[PDB]
Design a protein around this ligand. Structure first.
Ligand SMILES: CCCCCCCCCCCCCCCCCC(=O)OC[C@H](COP(=O)([O-])OCC(O)COP(=O)([O-])OC[C@@H](COC(=O)CCCCCCCCCCCCCCCCC)OC(=O)CCCCCCCCCCCCCCCCC)OC(=O)CCCCCCCCCCCCCCCCC
Ligand SMILES: CCCCCCCCCCCCCCCCCC(=O)OC[C@H](COP(=O)([O-])OCC[N+](C)(C)C)OC(=O)CCCCCCCCCCCCCCCCC
Ligand SMILES: CCCCCCCCCCCCCCCCCC(=O)OC[C@H](COP(=O)([O-])OCC[N+](C)(C)C)OC(=O)CCCCCCCCCCCCCCCCC
Ligand SMILES: CCCCCCCCCCCCCCCCC[C@@H](O)O[C@H](CO[C@H](O)CCCCCCCCCCCCCCC)COP(=O)(O)OCC[N+](C)(C)C
Ligand SMILES: CCCCCCCC/C=C/CCCCCCCC(=O)OC[C@H](COP(=O)(O)OCCN)OC(=O)CCCCCCC/C=C/CCCCCCCC
Ligand SMILES: CCCCCCCC/C=C\CCCCCCCC(=O)OC[C@H](COP(=O)(O)OCCN)OC(=O)CCCCCCC/C=C\CCCCCCCC
Ligand SMILES: CCCCCCCC/C=C\CCCCCCCC(=O)OC[C@H](COP(=O)(O)OCCN)OC(=O)CCCCCCC/C=C\CCCCCCCC
Ligand SMILES: Nc1ncnc2c1ncn2[C@@H]1O[C@H](COP(=O)(O)OP(=O)(O)O)[C@@H](O)[C@H]1O
Lengths: 49, 347, 54, 459, 98, 99, 320, 54
């Protein structure tokens, strides 16, 4: 307890932290899946594999 | 003004601009312009004072005259062609009227005085919105009707805009007037490249909008409207002054910053059309913009001006309100030169 | 023995109404700090009427 | 070239994550390591250049300049750590970051394989230099000096950008190999004359040419020690490197458009040496000496013979090292007495012996004393100019006489005589300063031992 | 082109010249601004009626609507200026300088 | 006076607190180690190792190879009466001049 | 969440929060009066929050830890030095006056924020509108200059033109001889060096300017020492002041919203306290400014934001 | 040093150009902000555009 008045960010905003981490994880998963699907579609269209 | 009224007026301005950008009918385009002006005037007059009232009056008069000329051009084009679709206009007189009306709306020289006058009259947020949105819409119309623009008239107005903006910004000391003259010069550049590559026009518009947003957000953060007011910011938060110095260097077109990309691409495109004197003059004239950017940078960041005594209390307190996307604007306005070939995606 | 930094003279150079003063520009003044000009003493000049006697 | 570029981009996080008292040590050690790594580029071929990839390539002209830059960075670090003791940790890190960015841009400039990328990088070298000058300069004139430097360089360089984009549109490529193998003669016409003017004038302003040089005294005198060291050693050589690279496509128009520039360079070399004879400021004297030497390099490039290019390269390297050493010596004497007047401090020969020895060696190398590489380059240029015409010998002889005169005048005024009676704050020379002088001078003598490493591709 | 269109275009040109040349009053300039849209309305309806553009007959009504919207905006700005300065003179709108 | 400004401080001497100072830093240990790393790395590593590396760089410029090739060509040409230096770089049979 | 436009459209309304007793009461008086005791008693009896006189280091008390900072980092002025040598050549008098005005402005902003966000009334031991009496007394005694007075007037205009006046102004009138007697009995040498004219000038400014000025805005209560010593009658008189001709009845929800948004932003409150007017008294050179700012950043809990100071015991920085 | 380096080489490129830019900047920015004046300028510009450009 150093501040006479409670700082606005004294405690982590757990809702915001969860939203941020979940959004990052979801975006990375979606990007990986999208790249996989794009590679497969390109292979199918150009008759490689 | 009530927050609901303010947000609905902002949404009406954006609705008018979107109507202009999505309409295929000249009457609907004119309706969009009228709605934009009607909802924009109270936004300028939000903070009531004689300066705000005078700025709103001058802006309204200029925009009303431009809209009347635009409607006359539409009617004349209808007379000689019987067409309402926005395409290559079928009458040179109607095209000249339309070009002059849109140039007056954009503030191109010799229709420029209202830009510094209104920008100095209105607050920082109002100036930001004014510059960005009210340059966004008429340039959309001009890009749509580019194939019938008279190159001589368009390039004359563009060169006049560049010269006048450089000289005015050179003389001014007020930050809002400096920003207005910078806007005039950048509008000159964009309209100069317009009759050759609307894609390059859009690229320059995007870069200019990013840089202007970053600069105006920094000015709002520092709460400075003059040069001396900005000269005290180094003693309270030197990070803002350093970021603003980098942004000012970018706005001058210094490599390898983002501001060099529009000038570089415009010079290349205009040279492709066997035009050399115009790109050379446009490149050489920008040194005035760079000079007054550098003069502003000396006062704020590269040197340390005298401070006052209550700055200690200002140190003790903290900046409460946050302007989101400011770091993104600062990054995108300084460090996107290697990503230049994305203009094909913009195409 | 230390790096030179701008002083009051430099600040006053940079803090006029406009750079490069002329006669008219010297006659000009810088804008107010809060953009609010002082109110003008405009006289109301209310209408005066003779209600009566006829 | 990535094995040299990436270590600098890793030097940046090292500088910004090091402890407050270890920044100079870390930066110096790893800069020396990067220089040692960059010494490998000196192994050049006898037929073609070293083409690493589609973006970066190395040549017998690019290699010595890269090695000079990588070797010059730690010396700038030493001088800066000398004169920036009271700065905060963040500002020290910012200064080191500016130096690192300047070195990175210089490396990419000298290794760029395309003219437009070369233009972008050699223009990008202005921003760190301008920040350094206008932020850490001592005098009030640093702002005006920065303005002069920036606007001279940019007014020179913008028509160069227009010319480069026009050449790309006309020919299809700005790649140096393509423009060399597919070069075509330049017909005598106004359009070709103005293209030649755009390119050559940009690089002449960068050189600088006589009549376009005021920014050089302004910037060099008013910049900090590191800025002065980098301005003369490397940043002046961008013009010469560009002119050597760009003159491939400008023939045969160069045979006729070189007369005004040759006359300007020769007569201004004489004039700037004479100016050095009557200078009341030591930094100004060194700056005008730099102007004279770069005017000689301009003469060599304009006459454009295989013997002139070799002399031009050797003179560029030698002048870079000598000018850096002279600026360092002047900065040490300035730190002693806090003034740049040349006659204020005298008797330094009897007040500081080893520093007087360093002064003597630097002055001997400044004038063309054989077998130094300064003399090698100057003699090659003089012989090529003699082949060009037989009065260039008259002009070169006058320049050499005045060069010896002003060099020994500076040495005698600063060192000989009797010490100033009232100046009693001249402490013994520091180990750091003596090591800086030794690291400046020994590579010069080693390059004298092995001269073919700095004679360019024409060797 | 008949002479009626000539006269209507001349009327619009006269109204435009009147707006661009102020004398003292902001109200007179607003009146000139209203005349321009009157001429535009007349020209548009003369063109539409002559060519039997049946669906275009609704355009002049929208033109009038936005004309009087602009008139309302100008009157609001004029009353604010009058409250500020005591007269609607355009000479008092000089606080801002170009 | 027109400001509340600090007076210009007196210049600081490193020898005052540390008589055996190399001039690198105020702290004696950091100063000594800065001197050690600078001297060792710079002089020893860079100077000695880079200079001997440059001295023993392989002959990629083909000076010795060119000398040997010239010796062989001179031997062959002088042993058969041919000119030592040809008068043409290319073959006039392969060059087709315009008429 | 923090108050803002979204909260306003959600429905948080100042008029709804007000409880008809949300009054701003300022107790004023000359040097060494019973105004402090009167303010304490009024705040206690009426249930209002008491804000003592806004002296130096009030901003220190309201930020970081409650402990006041060093004089070099907060105020750079001394009341003791002003008393001992009023006509110093270093601008101490006007530095002190400007810093005290800024402190009073900050305290008034805090009190207004408390009243608007809580509905409870506030009792200030002095306000912005009574601060100028010390400036007039200093100027008429020759302690400061006309340029200093003009700068104070500019700052006061552009700052206090935005805030609402107090509901109640209670002035305790004490004659100068009694003031000097109380000062002599207190025994503090620095204020024992106060001259008679300086005490008289404050009284003249209070009676001739402050009271006539505030009477037009709203009702003003004037009490002598004996009347002020009995606070029951003072509270009874305050309670039966049903008249209110000030702007508070005229205020609406939108105006209150703007006022709350202004007062909750302290940097926006103190925006015009540092305007580029280079008076020698208050101007600080570049080197001194940089050194003092470096020291302030070197302070324990000042380098980063309040939630991000590790050395004072803040955790979870990497997830904050 | 004096006549050429410090006087005339300064007068030709850097000083004359700067003086011209300053004069033109003063000329452009020396406006009283009168809508009558610059709207008359607008009328002149419109007539010039209509006639000169074909
Ligand atoms: C929850 C926590 C509590 C509430 C927090 C505040 C938000 C409350 C709701 C809200 O929107 O309030 C603001 C405000 C209502 O509150 P207020 O009290 O009137 O605020 C006054 C000031 O705005 C307040 O002053 P300010 O300094 O905060 O200004 C706010 C605003 C001021 O700016 C605006 O209002 C919009 C300006 C847009 C200009 C053009 C942007 C770039 C366009 C690029 C085009 C393509 C290239 O934004 C900025 O200043 C910069 C923000 C980023 C702009 C650029 C974004 C690029 C993407 O509402 C709006 O501004 C409209 C919101 C909707 C706009 C988009 C509609 C589609
Ligand atoms: C109002 C007063 C203004 C005074 C300005 C004075 C400026 C003086 C410095 C610049 C000019 C220097 C001229 C030197 C004299 C020799 C000229 C010469 O060789 O001409 C013949 C030369 C060569 O022509 P030529 O005569 O050899 O050609 C004969 C050959 N055939 C038959 C094939 C045609 O002419 C040119 O080079 C013409 C192009 C010149 C382009 C302009 C650049 C000149 C240099 C600019 C330097 C700028 C910085 C310094 C000034 C600031
Ligand atoms: C077939 C074999 C052929 C020969 C092969 C040789 C291989 C050598 C392999 C071991 C090398 C590493 C150990 C020795 C390192 C040098 C230490 C030394 O000499 O100190 C004595 C000198 C002198 O020591 P001193 O002066 O401190 O001590 C004197 C003695 N007392 C204690 C009494 C005072 O050390 C210094 O001056 C210290 C300076 C800093 C040293 C930092 C070393 C960092 C680690 C090594 C990095 C090497 C990178 C080289 C560049 C990259 C590769 C080219
Ligand atoms: C205190 C007293 C001082 C004087 C006494 C000192 C002690 C006696 C020293 C006497 C030396 C006198 C000169 C005699 C030198 C003998 C060695 C010399 O001859 O070798 C040269 C060696 O030359 C070296 O290459 C010189 C090294 C050059 C180093 C350049 C700088 C190193 C990096 C520094 C970074 C700075 C960069 C600067 C810009 C590039 C010759 O080259 P080369 O004949 O073929 O070598 C033969 C080996 N081969 C056949 C396999 C090739
Ligand atoms: C491009 C790169 C090519 C490949 C390069 C490979 C080589 C990698 C180079 C590694 C860098 C070498 C270390 C750099 C010098 C470190 C400086 C240093 O030692 O710090 C000083 C140090 C600690 O800081 P203080 O002075 O105490 O400050 C206290 C403040 N209150 O001083 C001391 O007290 C230490 C004394 C005893 C340590 C002796 C260290 C001797 C050096 C050898 C250690 C390295 C091990 C060898 C690894 C070889 C790897 C190939
Ligand atoms: C007086 C000396 C020069 C004053 C420089 C003033 C700067 C702006 C001048 C505007 C350009 C002046 C004309 C330049 C010539 C030109 O534009 O075209 C050159 C030529 C013609 O192209 P085409 O259209 O294909 O020809 C038709 C073929 N059938 O194209 C090119 O070579 C492109 C090169 C661009 C060069 C333009 C500027 C170069 C001249 C400046 C000299 C060097 C810069 C000196 C810096 C000082 C600045 C004043
Ligand atoms: C092709 C035609 C080009 C048309 C013009 C385009 C720009 C050409 C290059 C101009 C560079 C911009 C220079 C800025 C000029 C305006 C400067 C000014 O007005 O003040 C002069 C100012 C000092 O005056 P004071 O008012 O007393 O100091 C306070 C400054 N606030 O001077 C300066 O600081 C600038 C000096 C250096 C800039 C010029 C350097 C040399 C120019 C390059 C030479 C080639 C020019 C090409 C033609
Ligand atoms: N604006 C100001 N300028 C100068 N001095 C001030 C100012 N405000 C308060 N002071 C000083 O602060 C001190 C506060 O004393 P005060 O609280 O009035 O005593 P008491 O509580 O006995 O009435 C006074 O001596 C006064 O001189």
């Amino acid at each position: 307890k150093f501040y006479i008045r409670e700082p606005p960010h004294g405690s982590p905003d757990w809702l915001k932290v969860g939203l941020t981490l979940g959004t990052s994880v979801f975006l990375w998963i979606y990007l990986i899946k999208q790249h996989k699907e794009d590679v497969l579609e390109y292979k199918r269209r150009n008759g490689l594999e | 003004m009530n927050p609901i009224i303010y947000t609905t007026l902002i949404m009406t301005v954006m609705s008018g601009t979107m109507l202009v950008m999505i309409s295929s009918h000249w009457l609907l385009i004119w309706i969009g312009f009228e709605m934009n002006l009607l909802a924009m005037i109270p936004v300028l007059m939000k903070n009531f004072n004689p300066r705000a009232t005078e700025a709103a009056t001058k802006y309204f008069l200029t925009q009303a005259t431009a809209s009347m000329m635009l409607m006359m051009a539409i009617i004349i084009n209808l007379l000689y062609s019987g067409q309402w679709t926005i395409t290559k206009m079928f009458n040179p007189v109607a095209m000249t009227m339309m070009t002059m009306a849109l140039a007056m709306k954009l503030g191109l020289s010799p229709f420029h005085f209202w830009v510094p006058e209104v920008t100095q009259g209105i607050s920082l947020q109002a100036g930001l919105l004014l510059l960005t949105w009210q340059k966004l819409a008429p340039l959309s119309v001009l890009c749509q009707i580019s194939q019938s623009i008279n190159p001589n008239l368009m390039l004359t107005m563009a060169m006049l805009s560049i010269l006048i903006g450089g000289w005015g910004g050179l003389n001014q000391t007020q930050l809002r007037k400096i920003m207005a003259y910078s806007s005039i010069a950048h509008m000159g550049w964009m309209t100069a490249v317009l009759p050759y590559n609307t894609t390059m026009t859009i690229l320059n518009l995007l870069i200019y909008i990013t840089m202007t947003l970053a600069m105006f957000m920094l000015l709002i953060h520092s709460s400075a409207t003059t040069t001396l007011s900005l000269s005290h910011t180094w003693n309270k938060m030197p990070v803002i002054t350093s970021l603003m110095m980098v942004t000012l260097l970018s706005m001058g077109g210094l490599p390898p910053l983002s501001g060099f990309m529009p000038k570089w691409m415009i010079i290349q495109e205009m040279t492709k059309n066997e035009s050399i004197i115009m790109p050379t003059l446009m490149a050489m004239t920008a040194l005035l913009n760079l000079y007054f950017y550098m003069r502003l940078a000396y006062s704020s960041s590269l040197t340390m001006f005298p401070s006052t005594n209550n700055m200690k209390m200002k140190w003790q307190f903290e900046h409460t309100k946050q302007m989101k996307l400011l770091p993104t604007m600062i990054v995108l306005s300084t460090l996107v030169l290697p990503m230049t070939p994305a203009l094909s995606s913009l195409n | 023995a230390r790096q030179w930094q701008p002083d009051v003279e430099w600040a006053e150079q940079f803090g006029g109404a406009v750079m490069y003063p002329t006669k008219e520009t010297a006659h000009w003044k810088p804008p107010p700090w809060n953009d609010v000009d002082p109110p003008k003493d405009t006289l109301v000049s209310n209408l005066t009427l003779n209600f009566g006697p006829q | 070239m990535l094995k040299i570029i990436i270590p600098t981009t890793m030097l940046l996080p090292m500088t910004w994550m090091s402890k407050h008292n270890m920044i100079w040590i870390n930066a110096t050690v790893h800069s020396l390591l990067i220089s040692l790594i960059s010494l490998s580029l000196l192994n050049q071929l006898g037929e073609n250049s070293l083409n690493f990839s589609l973006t970066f390539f190395s040549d017998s002209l690019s290699a010595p300049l890269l090695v000079l830059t990588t070797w010059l960075l730690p010396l700038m670090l030493m001088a800066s750590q000398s004169h920036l003791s009271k700065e905060t940790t963040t500002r020290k890190k910012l200064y080191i970051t500016m130096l690192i960015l300047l070195q990175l841009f210089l490396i990419m400039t000298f290794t760029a394989t395309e003219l437009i990328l070369f233009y972008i990088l050699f223009e990008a070298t202005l921003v760190p230099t301008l920040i350094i000058i206008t932020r850490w300069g001592n005098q009030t004139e640093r702002l005006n000096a920065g303005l002069y430097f920036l606007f001279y360089t940019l007014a020179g360089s913008l028509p160069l950008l227009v010319a480069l984009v026009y050449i790309q549109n006309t020919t299809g490529s700005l790649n140096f190999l393509i423009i060399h193998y597919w070069s075509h003669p330049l017909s005598n016409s106004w359009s070709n004359i103005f293209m030649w003017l755009a390119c050559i004038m940009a690089f002449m302003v960068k050189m600088p040419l006589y009549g376009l040089h005021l920014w050089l005294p302004k910037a060099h005198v008013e910049a900090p020690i590191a800025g002065s060291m980098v301005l003369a050693a490397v940043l002046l050589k961008l013009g010469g490197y560009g002119m050597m690279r760009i003159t491939t496509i400008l023939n045969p128009l160069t045979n006729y458009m070189a007369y005004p520039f040759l006359m300007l360079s020769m007569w201004g070399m004489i004039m700037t040496s004479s100016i050095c004879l009557r200078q009341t400021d030591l930094k100004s004297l060194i700056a005008y000496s730099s102007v004279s030497h770069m005017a000689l390099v301009i003469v060599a490039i304009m006459i454009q013979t295989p013997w002139s290019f070799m002399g031009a390269t050797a003179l560029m390297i030698a002048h870079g090292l000598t000018s850096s050493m002279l600026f360092c010596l002047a900065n040490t004497n300035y730190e002693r007495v806090h003034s740049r007047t040349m006659i204020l401090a005298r008797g330094l020969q009897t007040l500081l012996p080893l520093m007087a020895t360093w002064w003597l060696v630097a002055s001997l190398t400044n004038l063309a004393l054989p077998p130094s590489i300064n003399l090698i380059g100057e003699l090659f240029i003089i012989t090529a100019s003699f082949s060009w015409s037989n009065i260039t010998i008259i002009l070169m002889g006058m320049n050499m006489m005045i060069t010896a005169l002003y060099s020994l005048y500076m040495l005698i005024t600063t060192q000989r005589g009797k010490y100033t009676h009232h100046i009693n704050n001249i402490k013994p020379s520091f180990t750091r300063e003596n090591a800086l002088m030794a690291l400046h001078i020994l590579p010069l003598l080693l390059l004298t031992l092995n001269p073919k490493m700095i004679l360019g591709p024409l060797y | 082109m008949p002479l009626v269109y000539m006269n209507i275009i001349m009327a619009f040109a006269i109204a435009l010249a009147g707006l661009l040349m102020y004398r003292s009053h902001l109200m007179s300039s607003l009146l000139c601004l209203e005349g321009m849209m009157l001429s535009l309305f007349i020209m548009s309806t003369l063109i539409i009626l002559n060519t039997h553009f049946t669906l275009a007959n609704m355009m002049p009504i929208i033109l009038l609507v936005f004309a009087a919207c602009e008139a309302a905006l100008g009157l609001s700005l004029l009353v604010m200026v009058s409250n500020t300065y005591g007269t609607d003179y355009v000479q008092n709108l000089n606080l801002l300088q170009c | 006076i027109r400001l509340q400004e600090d007076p210009d401080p007196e210049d600081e001497n490193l020898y005052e607190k540390n008589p055996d100072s190399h001039g690198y830093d105020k702290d004696p240990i950091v100063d000594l180690w800065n001197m050690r790393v600078v001297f060792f790395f710079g002089f020893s590593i860079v100077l000695v190792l880079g200079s001997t590396f440059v001295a023993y760089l392989p002959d990629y410029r083909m000076q010795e190879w060119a000398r040997r090739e010239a010796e062989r060509l001179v031997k062959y040409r002088e042993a058969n009466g041919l000119p030592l230096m040809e008068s043409n770089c290319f073959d006039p049979n392969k060059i087709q001049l315009p008429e | 969440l923090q108050y803002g436009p979204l909260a306003f459209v959600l429905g948080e309304r100042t008029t709804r929060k007000l409880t008809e007793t949300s009054k701003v009461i300022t107790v004023d008086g000359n040097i060494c009066s019973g105004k402090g005791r009167l303010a304490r008693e009024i705040a206690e009896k009426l249930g209002l929050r008491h804000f003592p006189e806004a002296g130096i280091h009030y901003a220190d008390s309201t930020t970081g830890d409650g402990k006041p900072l060093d004089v070099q980092l907060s105020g750079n002025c001394s009341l003791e030095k002003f008393y001992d040598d009023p006509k110093s050549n270093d601008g101490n008098s006007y530095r002190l006056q400007s810093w005290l005005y800024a402190s009073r402005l900050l305290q008034y902003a805090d009190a207004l924020e408390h009243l608007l966000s809580t509905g409870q009334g506030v009792v200030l031991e002095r306000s912005i509108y009574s601060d100028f009496v010390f400036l007039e007394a200093m100027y008429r005694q020759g302690f400061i200059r006309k340029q200093c007075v003009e700068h104070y007037n500019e700052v006061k205009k552009v700052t206090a033109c935005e805030y609402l006046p107090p509901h109640v102004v209670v002035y305790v009138d004490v004659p100068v001889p009694e003031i000097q007697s109380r000062i002599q009995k207190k025994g503090n040498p620095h204020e024992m060096k106060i001259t008679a004219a300086y005490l008289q000038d404050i009284e003249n400014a209070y009676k001739k300017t402050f009271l006539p000025e505030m009477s037009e805005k709203c009702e003003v209560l004037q009490y002598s020492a004996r009347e002020a010593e009995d606070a029951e009658k003072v509270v009874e008189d305050i309670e039966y002041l049903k008249c209110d001709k000030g702007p508070w009845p005229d205020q609406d929800d939108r105006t209150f919203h703007r006022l709350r948004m202004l007062v909750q932003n302290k940097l926006e409150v103190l925006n015009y306290t540092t305007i580029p007017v280079y008076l020698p008294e208050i101007t600080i050179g570049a080197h001194q400014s940089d050194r003092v700012f470096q020291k302030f950043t070197e302070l324990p809990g000042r380098k980063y934001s309040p939630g991000y100071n590790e050395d004072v015991g803040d955790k979870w920085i990497w997830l904050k | 040093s004096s006549l050429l380096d410090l006087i005339w080489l300064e007068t030709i490129l850097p000083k004359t150009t700067s003086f011209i830019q300053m004069k033109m900047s003063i000329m452009v920015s020396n406006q009283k902000g009168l809508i009558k004046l610059y709207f008359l300028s607008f009328l002149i510009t419109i007539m010039i555009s209509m006639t000169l450009f074909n």
